């Protein structure tokens, strides 16, 4: 009667969980514990059914989606996990975790233009900084001169952060990009803060042009100085500007 007691255990827990969901159809603890209880049976086509009718009652929670997808991804059913990630991200665009875990899943698989397509869809909704420079970090960790150039001019139109203006000045500090890196500095210098500078762009521009030679480095800190902020700088850096310009040149007597 081992079959009898086994099916008794299964039928009593199923009857318990079905009465628990039938009482409260809104708290979703019941569906996730019942569905992962059948996931503990390790061979199922019904825990899929439990989740896929558990989102009829509430599709707007992230927990059910990411738990059903990490269930389907925890097992070898990769096609189904991808096939529910795409409906998760088209149904709920603004939640970051679905995009992150679906990109991460395809990173652990091949780096196919599927993954880049997932990413550019994720770009298309105009997210925050956290996602965008994560995608440029993806393009750097596959060593893309071409594609990290491609996807990062569309960046700056939406985030004009000074922290991001100085890091569109990155082809200098990785490729040195001479003439068009100087054009990146032109793009840095003409935009917002024309007389007010946001007090930070030309610090890093002076750091690179001081890392460069005396090509045209005298101008921007001292002789393009019409654009001051009431003193041209705080007290914290102008003597540092002077000894910044002093001892890194031809040093003529």
């Amino acid at each position: 009667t081992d079959e009898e007691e086994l099916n008794d255990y299964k039928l009593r827990k199923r009857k318990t969980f079905e009465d628990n969901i039938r009482k409260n159809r809104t708290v979703i603890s019941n569906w996730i514990k019942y569905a992962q209880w059948e996931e503990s049976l390790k061979e199922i086509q019904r825990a899929r059914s439990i989740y896929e009718r558990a989102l009829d009652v509430d599709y707007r929670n992230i927990t059910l989606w990411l738990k059903y997808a990490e269930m389907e991804m925890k097992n070898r059913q990769v096609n189904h996990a991808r096939n529910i990630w795409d409906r998760a991200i088209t149904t709920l665009p603004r939640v970051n975790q679905f995009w992150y875990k679906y990109t991460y899943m395809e990173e652990m698989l091949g780096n196919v233009a599927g993954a880049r397509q997932v990413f550019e869809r994720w770009m298309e909704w105009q997210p925050e900084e956290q996602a965008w420079h994560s995608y440029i970090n993806f393009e750097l960790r596959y060593k893309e001169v071409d594609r990290a150039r491609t996807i990062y001019e569309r960046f700056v139109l939406v985030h004009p952060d000074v922290k991001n203006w100085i890091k569109y000045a990155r082809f200098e500090e990785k490729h040195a990009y001479f003439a068009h890196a100087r054009k990146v500095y032109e793009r840095a210098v003409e935009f917002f803060g024309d007389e007010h500078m946001d007090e930070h762009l030309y610090v890093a521009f002076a750091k690179f042009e001081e890392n460069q030679k005396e090509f045209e480095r005298v101008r921007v800190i001292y002789k393009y100085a019409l654009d001051r902020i009431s003193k041209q700088d705080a007290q914290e850096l102008f003597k540092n500007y002077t000894i910044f310009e002093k001892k890194f040149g031809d040093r003529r007597g």
Binding site: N79, N83, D86, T90, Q117, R121
Partner: peptide, 16 residues
């Protein structure tokens, strides 16, 4: 098949 049917328009990007 097991998977869905993949649809992109004739000119533009991938239709979802």
């Amino acid at each position: 098949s097991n998977a869905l049917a993949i649809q992109v328009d004739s000119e533009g990007k991938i239709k979802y």
